[PDB]
Amino acid sequence: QTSAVQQKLAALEKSSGGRLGVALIDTADNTQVLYRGDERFPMCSTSKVMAAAAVLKQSETQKQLLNQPVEIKPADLVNYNPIAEKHVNGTMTLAELSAAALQYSDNTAMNKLIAQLGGPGGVTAFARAIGDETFRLDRTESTLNTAIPGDPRDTTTPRAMAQTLRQLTLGHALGETQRAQLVTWLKGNTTGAASIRAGLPTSWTVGDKTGSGGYGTTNDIAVIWPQGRAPLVLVTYFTQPQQNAESRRDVLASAARIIAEGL
């Protein structure tokens, strides 16, 4: 029952200190389970999925767009840029910047993707054009991770991001080669081993993007191909009242366990 899952999520949330948002879509019957599904949460690095997908859309009609070299200037470096810092005063392709933003959550690469889309408003505009009316991106890295309570900048709801994640990876928001590329990048993420993945059996396939930021904000959005059933889309947002709160990736694993076991 969806409701059993709710009680367990609510109980999880009380023990968490913080505020939990969940949104599951089960594509076997298109059922939805929601916990705080229409409450806004700071998106942090999970936003990078939208930036990369928007650039992929651009590439549907600028054929060679992803192989074009983009200059990495000293002014482009931000804190936590493990991939791009190794290319300062050099070049990366929008493909390499996509992979770095998605699979290592590189913030300099994210800012390059945002810049390629014409700024925060350019990412938001792509969300609007795929029917995501809730997503809003308002700032660049790394200041978009401030996750200040009650600030609607750089937020979405779990319901909106699960709907959009399905659109991008299993629906028709992107072209076929672009959709495959996006799914290949998410499946190759390196930073989500302790989040949703750690709540799921290892035989299941997972494409995911983690997020982290201020106020102990710990997020994950995933696409999940279990054995023996249609894929699932699971969004797990978590933030805390203290600005210096510690990340709680285990809480997201617990949320995913609750879901894999009860649905």
Residue 90: strand pairing partners = 72
Place of tokens 């996006």: 182
Of 45, 59, 212, 247, which one is the catalytic site residue?
45
Give the DSSP letter string of 53-88: HHHHHHHTTSGGGGGSEEEE-GGG--SS-TTGGGGT
Terminal-to-terminal C-alpha distance of the chain: 7
Closest CA to 231 of 222, 239, 240: 222
Method: X-ray
Q: What gap in Å lies between CA 107 and CA 104, rounded to an integer?
A: 9
- Report which DSSP code applies to 90: E
Dihedral over alpha carbons 253, 258, 260, 263 (to 10 degrees): -150
Q: What are phi and psi of 16, to 5 degrees?
A: -80, -15
Give the CATH number, domain containing residue 168: 3.40.710.10
| Exposure string for 81-91, b = 16+ CB within 10 A, e = fewer | bebbeebeeee
Which run of H or of E encompasses 177? helix 176-187
Quick check: is 45 catalytic?
Answer: yes
Which run of H or of E encompasses 145? none
| Helix 94-103 / helix 48-59 crossing angle, nearest 10 deg | 160
- Report which DSSP code applies to 19: E
Q: What gap in Å lies between CA 25 and CA 163, rounded to an integer?
A: 8
Find the discontinuities in the chain where C to next N exceeds 2.5 angstroms and give the residue preceding each.
none
Q: Which residues contact 190 (CB under 8 A, 6 or more apart)?
A: 103, 104
Domain that holds residue 109: 2-262
Which amino acid, residue 176?
E
Experimental structure resolution, Å: 2.3
Sheet of 205-213, strand order = 31-35, 19-26, 232-239, 217-225, 205-213
H helices of 88-170, in order, are 94-103, 107-116, 120-129, 158-169
Closest CA to 199 of 1, 19, 24, 7: 24
Count of domains forming the chain: 1
Q: What gap in Å lies between CA 248 and CA 194, rounded to an integer?
A: 9
Which amino acid, residue 30?
N
At 209 the three-state DSSP class reads strand
Closest CA to 263 of 47, 33, 46: 33
Asked if 251 and 218 touch (Cβ cutoff 8 Å), the reply is yes
How many residues are recorded in the chain? Answer: 263
Asked if 239 and 217 touch (Cβ cutoff 8 Å), the reply is yes
Q: Which residues contact 114 (CB under 8 A, 6 or more apart)?
A: 51, 120, 122, 123, 137, 140, 141
Asked if 154 and 143 touch (Cβ cutoff 8 Å), the reply is no
Q: What gap in Å lies between CA 9 and CA 228, rounded to an integer?
A: 25
Binding site as annotated, residues for Zn(2+): 141, 145
- Report which DSSP code applies to 175: -
